[PDB]
Amino acid sequence: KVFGRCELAAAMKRHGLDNYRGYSLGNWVCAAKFESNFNTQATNRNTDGSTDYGILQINSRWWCNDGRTPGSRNLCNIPCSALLSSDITASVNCAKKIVSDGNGMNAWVAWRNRCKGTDVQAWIRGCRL
Ligand SMILES: [Cl-]
Ligand SMILES: [Cl-]
Ligand SMILES: [Cl-]
Ligand SMILES: [Ho]
Ligand SMILES: [Ho]
Ligand SMILES: [Ho]
Ligand code: NA
């Protein structure tokens, strides 16, 4: 599923991501924009053989099981395919663990490089929230 901007903002809010660990909703929408272009089915291979999945490009190296990332962990206790669903529950619940790992949203390199320090509230402008 390819979400609209405000559609994704609303879904993220319903799943409790707004201000989760102090990160306003615009931060999460911005991260999703640059990680996946709001596409739940996005995947991308990493240099180490791991794969990133879903709207927030969650890596199989640590967070989900895809059966082909030898030596990895599955800390969100989910198949990576769950991160591709039209229902964002799995991606959100796993993102909540990730952002709690210590480095906050710096875990998403695209957030650090493209959202951090910018006017991220623009990403929820106009949305009914
Ligand atoms: Cl915001
Ligand atoms: Cl594996
Ligand atoms: Cl933080
Ligand atoms: Ho990535
Ligand atoms: Ho970590
Ligand atoms: Ho609201
Ligand atoms: Na894994």
Question: Which residues in the chain precede a discontinuity of more than 2.5 Å between C and N?
Answer: none
Token pair of 36 as six digits: 């996946």
Q: Is 52 a catalytic residue?
A: yes
Quote the ligand 7 centre to 105 CA distance (angstroms): 20
Which residues share a beta bridge with 52? 44, 59
Coarse DSSP helix, strand, coil percentages of the chain, rounded to the nearest 5 percent: 40, 10, 50
Give the single-character DSSP code of 119.
-
Q: Is 48 a catalytic residue?
A: no
Instruction: Work out the number of other CB atoms within 10 angstroms of the CB of residue 83.
Output: 28
Specify binding-site residues for substrate: 101
In whole angstroms, what is the distance from residue 27 CA to residue 119 CA? 9
Ligand minimally distant from the alpha carbon of residue 128:
6
Quote the ligand 3 centre to 101 CA distance (angstroms): 10
Q: Let me know: does 103 contact 116? Beta carbons within 8 Å.
A: no
Quote the ligand 6 centre to 122 CA distance (angstroms): 17
In whole angstroms, what is the distance from residue 124 CA to residue 75 CA? 30
Ligand minimally distant from the alpha carbon of residue 129:
6
Token pair of 28 as six digits: 């999460």
Q: Let me know: does 46 contact 119? Beta carbons within 8 Å.
A: no
Q: What class does CATH assign to 1-129?
A: mainly alpha
Task: Catalytic residue, from 52, 66, 87, 119: name it.
Answer: 52
Ligand minimally distant from the alpha carbon of residue 63:
7
The SS3 call for residue 107 is helix
Which sequence spans correspond to the domains of the chain?
A: 1-129
Resolved by: X-ray
At what resolution in Å was this solved? Answer: 1.4
Protein residues placing their CB within 5 Å of the ion ligand 3: 104
The SS3 call for residue 59 is strand
